[PDB]
């Protein structure tokens, strides 16, 4: 019962995890909510600088994000790339200026504006939210069979 | 009978067999000389630094992956439009009664109309093509999860189920597609006998 | 059994000419949403 | 070979005596000495190598031609 419950208080349960809760649900633009394959992959790299990038100190909260944040930039830029290239990201270095390392591949691919996900770049975004030997992603990506492991999982270091 | 000597004044040069042997026995000493102490430079260079260091001098260098497409019609701005269609067409017409087509698809010996209009216009597959008649033939799979263990998401083989990316596909795969689609000697067991 | 046929496509270009602008912008965004839809959908059936 | 006498005297650690000694189908020996000053658990200060290299005589018997002679420091190997 636990996919069918969230299939009908969807619409619900993410209002509450933006207004009342730490890791709040990923797929949010501009307020108004989605899901992880309706957001276009500048909107994914947009967001994900705003919860894992730190304005305020000018600094990433883990290189484990940092290096999450470039293993997408690197599918971003092979999917949308015609022929092989150099990584317009050559160490996840660059990412400390992320608002410019976002428009260095955004103008490298100006279809990623506008495109959504492809689909595997949903599930491997997603086995990259769960993968061991870095530190969970500090939001909630999709509702399925591993909801609460989503939810709760090291949810004590916010403080 | 005439004879017509087209030679440069190649039977001048004299004792031509050697001088051409020695021009390109030297061609290898300088190319190979080149090759050796260039490698061992290289080779030099990694045990004073290190290839600690050297390593990030490999630069990382990205494979295109497979993005298929619609093929929706683009759609140029109003400015351009109204151009190409006479002034005074607009509110001519009973929009009700235009018919239009808005959809198409196909199954044919070259799979959709997509990777049809591949071998049709442009001879030959693309990438987004290679591997649509790749995944509409049964040779390659999807996959996400955990596969030996490490987490595969992509494509992968359908017989033997190991990971294959979408820029070796072509090299892969591309025999057999070619081999099996679009006319060819009847296959029997896709008529069953 | 002599079933003839003969029909002819004319480019859609020439159909927009035909409808006022800011209804063709409009219609211009509503199929804008529609192509980020089917390849969404494309995408997720191709794989599974 | 005859390419190798070439990536020899390619190297700056490598000199004889006579440059122009005939370095083709002989044997050629290394005895060599090195020293290394540390500065860290593997990355080196101070390299030096050192000591003759020697020639097969037609009886066999080793004579002395150059000398190694490197030296360069924050090395990470001796090469
Ligand atoms: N008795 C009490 O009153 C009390 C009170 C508070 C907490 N606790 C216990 O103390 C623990 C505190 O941890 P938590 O609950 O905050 O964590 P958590 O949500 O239980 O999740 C921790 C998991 O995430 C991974 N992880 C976390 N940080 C990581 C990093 N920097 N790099 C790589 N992987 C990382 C770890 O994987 P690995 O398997 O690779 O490590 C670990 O299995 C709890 O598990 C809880 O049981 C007890």
């Given at each position: 019962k636990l996919v069918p419950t969230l299939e009908a208080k969807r619409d619900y349960i993410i209002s509450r995890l933006n207004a009342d809760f730490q890791k709040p649900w990923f797929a949010t633009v501009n307020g108004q909510a989605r899901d992880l394959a309706t957001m276009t992959?500048?909107?994914?790299?947009?967001?994900?600088?705003?919860?894992?990038?730190?304005?305020?100190?000018?600094?990433?909260?883990?290189?484990?994000?940092?290096?999450?944040?470039?293993?997408?930039?690197?599918?971003?830029?092979?999917?949308?790339?015609?022929?092989?290239?150099?990584?317009?990201?050559?160490?996840?270095?660059?990412?400390?200026?992320?608002?410019?390392?976002?428009?260095?591949?955004?103008?490298?691919?100006?279809?990623?504006?506008?495109?959504?996900?492809?689909?595997?770049?949903?599930?491997?975004?997603?086995?990259?939210?769960?993968?061991?030997?870095?530190?969970?992603?500090?939001?909630?990506?999709?509702?399925?069979?591993?909801?609460?492991?989503?939810?709760?999982?090291?949810?004590?270091?916010?403080? | 009978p005439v004879m017509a000597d087209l030679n440069g004044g190649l039977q001048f040069v004299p004792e031509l067999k050697e001088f051409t042997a020695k021009l390109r026995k030297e061609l290898v000493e300088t190319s190979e000389v080149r090759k050796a102490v260039s490698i061992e430079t290289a080779l030099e260079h990694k045990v004073v630094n290190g290839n600690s260091a050297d390593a990030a001098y490999a630069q990382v260098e990205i494979q295109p992956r497979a993005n298929i497409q619609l093929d929706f019609p683009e759609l140029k701005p109003y400015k351009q439009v109204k151009q190409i269609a006479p002034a005074e067409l607009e509110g001519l017409l009973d929009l009700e009664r235009v018919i239009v087509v808005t959809g198409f698809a196909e199954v044919g010996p070259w799979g959709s109309a997509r990777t049809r209009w591949e071998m049709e216009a442009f001879g030959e597959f693309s990438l987004e093509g290679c591997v649509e008649m790749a995944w509409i033939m049964g040779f390659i799979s999807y996959h996400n999860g955990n596969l030996k263990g490490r987490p595969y998401t992509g494509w992968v083989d359908s017989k033997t189920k190991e990971p294959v990316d979408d820029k070796d596909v072509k090299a892969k795969y591309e025999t057999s597609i070619l081999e099996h689609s679009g006319i060819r000697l009847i296959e029997p067991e896709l008529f069953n006998g | 059994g002599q079933k003839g046929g003969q029909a002819i496509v004319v480019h859609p270009d020439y159909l927009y000419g035909a409808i006022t602008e800011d209804r063709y912008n409009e219609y211009v965004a509503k199929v804008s949403a529609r192509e980020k839809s089917a390849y969404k959908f494309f995408h997720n059936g191709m794989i599974y | 070979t005859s390419k190798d006498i070439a990536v020899l005297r390619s190297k700056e650690w490598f000199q004889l005596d006579d440059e122009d000694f005939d370095l083709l189908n002989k044997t050629l020996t290394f005895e060599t000495e090195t020293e290394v000053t540390f500065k860290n658990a593997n990355i080196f200060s101070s390299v030096k190598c050192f000591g003759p290299i020697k020639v097969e005589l037609p009886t066999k018997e080793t004579v002395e031609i150059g000398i190694v002679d490197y030296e360069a420091g924050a090395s990470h190997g001796n090469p």
């Open positions: 992959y500048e909107e994914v790299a947009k967001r994900l600088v705003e919860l894992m990038f730190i304005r305020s100190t000018n600094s990433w909260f883990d290189v484990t994000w940092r290096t999450f944040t470039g293993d997408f930039l690197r599918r971003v830029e092979e999917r949308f790339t015609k022929s092989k290239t150099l990584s317009l990201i050559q160490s996840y270095s660059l990412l400390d200026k992320p608002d410019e390392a976002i428009e260095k591949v955004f103008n490298a691919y100006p279809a990623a504006r506008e495109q959504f996900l492809n689909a595997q770049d949903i599930d491997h975004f997603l086995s990259m939210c769960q993968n061991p030997m870095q530190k969970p992603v500090p939001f909630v990506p999709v509702l399925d069979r591993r909801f609460e492991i989503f939810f709760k999982k090291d949810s004590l270091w916010q403080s | - | - | -």
